């Protein structure tokens, strides 16, 4: 990938930083797999799936070079 503008979302990270007032964790709900991340991620899921819900995801010191939901299940073997 490239440097220079990791693509922190405007709407999404607005929803974060202004919904990151307290410890109350409302993370994404976004059913969207396009974000990009800061060091200030504070304990919460994501929803990095769109089947009929919203999927909890990795929170602490996860994959560090990525800009999306690299760990989020949708499928496997069968």
């Amino acid at each position: 990938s490239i440097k220079k503008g990791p693509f922190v979302d405007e709407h999404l990270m607005k929803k974060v930083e202004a919904q990151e007032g307290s410890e109350k964790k409302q993370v994404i709900k976004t059913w969207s797999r396009r974000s990009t991340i800061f060091p200030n991620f504070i304990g919460h899921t994501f929803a990095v799936y769109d089947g009929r819900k919203h999927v909890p995801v990795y929170v602490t010191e996860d994959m560090v070079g990525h800009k999306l939901g690299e760990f989020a299940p949708t499928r496997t073997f069968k």
């Binding site: 990795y58 996860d62 994959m63 990525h66 690299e70 760990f71 299940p73 073997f77």
Partner: protein, 113 residues
């Protein structure tokens, strides 16, 4: 024989014939010849007493590891074992690589045809 583990063969040139031992081999071996008088001699069992000492003290001072970093494979897998990639979505899911897991032939991950 001495640079890492052992490497026996003869009659050939020591410059890149390092390919056996992990991390590095031949290509980098003949491209990392950055020392004081180390070079391919076609006599892998001659001409060498202390030159190996210095051009090995480098390999220990070559903090870029090689064999010692054989485990960066395993440890970058260790980071990914949350079903991400190269360890969970490529090792815990038992799939192939090339992102043609199976449309062509495959022996290394699936050895059974």
């Amino acid at each position: 024989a001495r640079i890492a583990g052992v490497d026996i063969p003869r009659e050939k040139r020591v410059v890149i014939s390092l390919t056996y031992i992990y991390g590095i081999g031949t290509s980098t071996a003949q491209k990392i010849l950055e020392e004081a008088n180390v070079s391919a001699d076609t006599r892998v069992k001659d001409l060498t007493d202390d030159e190996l000492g210095r051009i090995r003290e480098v390999v220990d001072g070559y903090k870029v590891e090689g064999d010692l970093r054989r485990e960066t494979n395993l440890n970058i897998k260790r980071l990914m074992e949350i079903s991400s990639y190269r360890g969970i979505r490529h090792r815990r899911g038992l799939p192939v690589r090339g992102q043609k897991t199976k449309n062509n032939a495959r022996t290394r991950k699936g050895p059974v045809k």
